[PDB]
């Protein structure tokens, strides 16, 4: 029943709103300069960084990087909450549950981080601030280009013009990918995704009727994502040897063991 699908879609979008305090709709009101109460502090140089700690809530490149690190722990929490709401997810093998989040967390983080970017920079601290692409990019080696690729993916991704309701389904599709390393029972996972894929199909058709083959165009983005992830992990591994005086959060480090 399509009705059965639209209901799954409402359900999902619902959980998405509940789990994720900074939606893409809110992000874009902030980035388009909608209102006079939502205007971010703009961070584009070192004194702006300084003053920005006063208006919004060790070394510079390092303080920024750990600024992402605590963030990503937050995201993981968020995603974990969402995951629990996906029909079936919690019933699966527990060792599978862990696996799916372990490989799905980053790919989701980058999908939703795009919501907060535009071609000039990225929103930080729940929309209170905005760090310009150029500043990030001038960050010393090897922190210069830890964010560059993410921008590239976002600008491409953001042009598909998805909205929150589309994304809720799409991050559910990611979580339930039967092709993840160490998965115990794959079938039960794929049966849930099949439904998710099915929902997303209908969703995109209804919501974006003039967006031809969007559904397939969206599905191929999963390759760009994976690419970004591997580039990430690699970059971290160099960070960890140049910077033996630098910590990684426990939750984060569980995710990284392969
Ligand atoms: C990444 C992304 C971001 O860049 N996110 C980000 C980056 C930098 C900062 O701040 C830099 C100094 C101003 C922030 C702001 N948030 C924090 O660092 C932070 C907020 C709150 C707390 C705290 N709150 C209550 C009690 C105690 N502490 C601490 C720190 C945000 C990135 C890269 C790749 C993927 C995703 C994200």
UniProtKB/Swiss-Prot annotation:
Highest expression in adipose tissue. Lower in skeletal muscle, spleen, heart and liver. Also detectable in placenta, lung and ovary. Residues 4-258 form the NR LBD domain. Induction: (Microbial infection) Expression increases when incubated with M.tuberculosis or its lipoprotein LpqH; induction is TLR2-dependent (at protein level). PDPK1 activates its transcriptional activity independently of its kinase activity. One of its GO terms (biological process) is BMP signaling pathway. One of its GO terms (molecular function) is transcription coregulator binding. It is found in: Nucleus; Cytoplasm. Residues 1-46 are annotated as: Interaction with FAM120B. Its main location: nucleus. There is a cross-link at residue 18 (Glycyl lysine isopeptide (Lys-Gly) (interchain with G-Cter in ubiquitin)). The keyword Transmembrane does not apply. Keywords: Activator, Biological rhythms, Cytoplasm, Diabetes mellitus, Disease variant, DNA-binding, Glycoprotein, Isopeptide bond, Metal-binding, Nucleus, Obesity, Phosphoprotein, Receptor, Transcription, Transcription regulation, Ubl conjugation, Zinc, Zinc-finger. Phosphorylated in basal conditions and dephosphorylated when treated with the ligand. May be dephosphorylated by PPP5C. Ubiquitinated by E3 ubiquitin-protein ligase complex containing FBXO9; leading to proteasomal degradation. Ubiquitinated at Lys-18 by TRIM55 leading to proteasomal degradation. Ubiquitinated by E3 ubiquitin-protein ligase STUB1/CHIP; leading to proteasomal degradation. It comes from the Eukaryota. Rosiglitazone binds at residues 69-72, 106, 232, 256. GO terms for cellular component: chromatin; cytosol; intracellular membrane-bounded organelle; nucleoplasm; nucleus; receptor complex; RNA polymerase II transcription regulator complex. A motif (9aaTAD) lies at residues 250-258. It is linked to Defects in PPARG can lead to type 2 insulin-resistant diabetes and hyptertension. PPARG mutations may be associated with colon cancer. Belongs to the nuclear hormone receptor family. NR1 subfamily. Nuclear receptor that binds peroxisome proliferators such as hypolipidemic drugs and fatty acids. Once activated by a ligand, the nuclear receptor binds to DNA specific PPAR response elements (PPRE) and modulates the transcription of its target genes, such as acyl-CoA oxidase. It therefore controls the peroxisomal beta-oxidation pathway of fatty acids. Key regulator of adipocyte differentiation and glucose homeostasis. ARF6 acts as a key regulator of the tissue-specific adipocyte P2 (aP2) enhancer. The 9aaTAD motif is a transactivation domain present in a large number of yeast and animal transcription factors. This is Peroxisome proliferator-activated receptor gamma. It comes from Homo sapiens (Human). The lineage of its organism: Eukaryota, Metazoa, Chordata, Craniata, Vertebrata.
């Amino acid at each position: 029943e399509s009705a059965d699908l639209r209901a799954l879609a409402k359900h999902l979008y619902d959980s998405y709103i509940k789990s994720f305090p900074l939606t893409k709709a809110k992000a874009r009101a902030i980035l388009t300069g909608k209102t006079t109460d939502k205007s971010p502090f703009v961070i584009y140089d070192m004194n702006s960084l300084m003053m920005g700690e006063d208006k919004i809530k060790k070394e510079v490149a390092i303080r920024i990087f750990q600024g992402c690190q605590f963030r990503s722990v937050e995201a993981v929490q968020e995603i974990t909450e969402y995951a629990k709401s996906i029909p079936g997810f919690v019933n699966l093998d527990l060792n599978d549950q862990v696996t799916l989040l372990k490989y799905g967390v980053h790919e989701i983080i980058y999908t939703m981080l795009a919501s907060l970017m535009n071609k000039d920079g990225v929103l930080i601290s729940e929309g209170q601030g905005f760090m310009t692409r150029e500043f990030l990019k001038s960050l010393r080696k090897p922190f210069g280009d830890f964010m560059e690729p993410k921008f590239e993916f976002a600008v491409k991704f953001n042009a598909l013009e998805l909205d929150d309701s589309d994304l809720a389904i799409f991050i559910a599709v990611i979580i339930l990918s039967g092709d993840r390393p160490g998965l115990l029972n794959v079938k039960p996972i794929e049966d849930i995704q099949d439904n998710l894929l099915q929902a997303l199909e209908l969703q995109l058709k209804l919501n974006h009727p003039e967006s031809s083959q969007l559904f397939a165009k969206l599905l191929q983005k999963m390759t760009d994502l994976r690419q970004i992830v591997t580039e990430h992990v690699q970059l971290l591994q160099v960070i960890k040897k140049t910077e033996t005086d630098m910590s990684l959060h426990p939750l984060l480090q569980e995710i990284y063991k392969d």
